[PDB]
């Protein structure tokens, strides 16, 4: 029985569980047994949760950051529906008391034993929030009458049931023979002792073949708990390989004897993995002699607690106790000023960190960076992050996963936190899965991520099968995309499109591609695949256009996905999460710049999905075709928004244009052309290919857009300066939360994105957001760039 659950886990995570045993690793084996028990205890809690408490797990609420509304409601397993007049300020129990009052009237034959399901979707409307606050009821108002289904307590409960399962003064010292080296020239081995991005002593090098055979300025007593010994083999300068090791193991014991380090290819790297290269055969190895001291374990918290300019740093350390009292948020500045190469100074800091008050989510997000590698500093950060909302945790989930790459040991406070929250929310567990599964091709992350997904599956027997279905569809889509890629080069598009449909109509494909949850959004059910409306896009990697159509949801079941294999979808995903954050921060301060942060999620090696924005078209397609090319875009909105509807559309356009003009400027999105800018029939303007960001520069205002803002008029200052305001207001909101973007962008350095690697890339975001300058000084600097963008258009 357990052999099947294990076979499914191996297929789902794309790594056999037998591979973990073959390592015969006490660290990997201890993680597996400990985390399985943690997840099983979490899974146990869910099978006893109340019916409203389960709805909270499986279908978390989607909420936005007086007036009337017509809504059709219908009880489960009944054709008969009822349209009722409800207020936007009315709570779901009022709709449920109206639906129950109508039911008793018609059927001749308590609303608190019910929940409203967004018909044909895995989204629910529960809790004491007015109908205006729900993402669905709110979106319908701007779109469409909301279609709801009265799901009873017994129907929600039948789901959970079905979803069941030590101080030596001697100077520190290390080098035997290093096998499998490819070079011309002499080989040297440089070695530095790091505690994050900072050094603990001088970088001692080795003496200047394919199999070459061959003292640190810090004491063995002074070595911090999280000390790294970083190596680099090079030719004497052409780099060859690098390797990192923790001087203390997971059981907190000082490393002794021989160690064979399987090095990673280059062209000292502190941020790199402390674990070796998996290609034992290919990788160049460096055998080192980690010296004897005796066993020596690191002092426990009980025994440990018992113990800016150059001159400015000395002042921060003197007033360290005053920093805990007067400036607790200044913890980061104090930790940096602490000397981690002095056990006496590093112990005094822990005595202050242990009595230190909890920090806000923003201050905790900085402490998660590689500049802060201490376990107690790390545990403090996660302890402060425990106050995160499930919706807030989701907004930063991508960045927290990247920080798992900075982790020194497999069992860590972050893995526990991320897994604990994942098992508490099916939406957080869904996305954590795909953030981990999409990096299984990467050899460095492959073990950590594999073991985390296995543990989640140990505590999600049903969700494992849900994700397996998603994973089965994505396999058929790679196989189908490969056909489209081969065939496209041989025949006419209608011939390839017809060939794709025949392939899709196969039993194997129809079964796989249908009745699954969207990997981009678990609440969107990709039901019946519309083979006739499916095709492929003309871009280099021939992306797939896969249309779906649910009957139970009507128009809401008509959804589409884009499968793209060949290119990196990470930066596009990062940019869209940053635009969604912008839209949230804007809405929080009453500014809805009607944004379209469409779904984009990487699922594999150069493989991922993109949500289809229905009823949209590229600016290039509209402009290709009006007596004047400038009038094409306005005449287009006139076609889709006739009569009194045009006025709403020009406003929708302006708002979205302002938001995207700021977003593309701030994020530094270059390569802007008519083909990677889209418009929705509602008037909403959005951007699509985010291949390049952070100036890889100035504010850009297009004349074809400035014309739509001006209501088609040559001179229209009322409407154009109203737009200038939206840009100013939106840019100043982001500036206040600039520290939030800088912290998340700092954590994303772990992703290994070519366009986000150095400190110069983060400087672009400091400059665009004019971080140093005062609000007045920064609003003027933007007013110069904006006015210059206006002159730049003819
Ligand atoms: C089969 C109809 C057709 O060829 N179209 C072309 C223009 C238009 N494109 C879209 N229409 C509606 N929604 C979207 C799109 C295009 N989107 C999209 C966004 N990033 C991407 O890559 C990073 C890609 C892709 F190149 F990989 F495919 C597509 C966003 C969603 C429809």
Swiss-Prot record:
User: Domain named C2 PI3K-type: which ranges?
Assistant: 168-291
User: Where are the stretches annotated G-loop?
Assistant: 536-542
GO CC terms, sorted? cytosol
Give the keywords, sorted.
Answer: Adaptive immunity, ATP-binding, Chemotaxis, Cytoplasm, Differentiation, Immunity, Inflammatory response, Innate immunity, Kinase, Lipid metabolism, Nucleotide-binding, Phosphoprotein, Transferase
* TM ranges: none
Superkingdom of this entry's organism? Eukaryota
Control of this protein's activity: Activated by growth factors and cytokine receptors through a tyrosine-kinase-dependent mechanism. Activated by RAS. IC87114 inhibits lipid kinase activity and is selective in cells at doses up to 5-10 uM. Among other effects, IC87114 reduces allergic responses, prevents the recruitment of antigen-specific T cells into target tissue, and affects natural killer cell chemotaxis.
Query: Which residue intervals define the domain PIK helical in the entry?
Result: 308-459
Subcellular location(s) of the protein: Cytoplasm
Briefly state the protein's biological role. Phosphoinositide-3-kinase (PI3K) phosphorylates phosphatidylinositol (PI) and its phosphorylated derivatives at position 3 of the inositol ring to produce 3-phosphoinositides. Uses ATP and PtdIns(4,5)P2 (phosphatidylinositol 4,5-bisphosphate) to generate phosphatidylinositol 3,4,5-trisphosphate (PIP3). PIP3 plays a key role by recruiting PH domain-containing proteins to the membrane, including AKT1 and PDPK1, activating signaling cascades involved in cell growth, survival, proliferation, motility and morphology. Mediates immune responses.
PANTHER family from the UniProt entry:
PHOSPHATIDYLINOSITOL 4,5-BISPHOSPHATE 3-KINASE CATALYTIC SUBUNIT DELTA ISOFORM, PHOSPHATIDYLINOSITOL KINASE
Q: How does it assemble?
A: Heterodimer of a catalytic subunit PIK3CD and a p85 regulatory subunit (PIK3R1, PIK3R2 or PIK3R3). Interacts with ERAS and HRAS.
Q: Output this protein's name.
A: Phosphatidylinositol 4,5-bisphosphate 3-kinase catalytic subunit delta isoform
Q: Which organism is it from?
A: Mus musculus
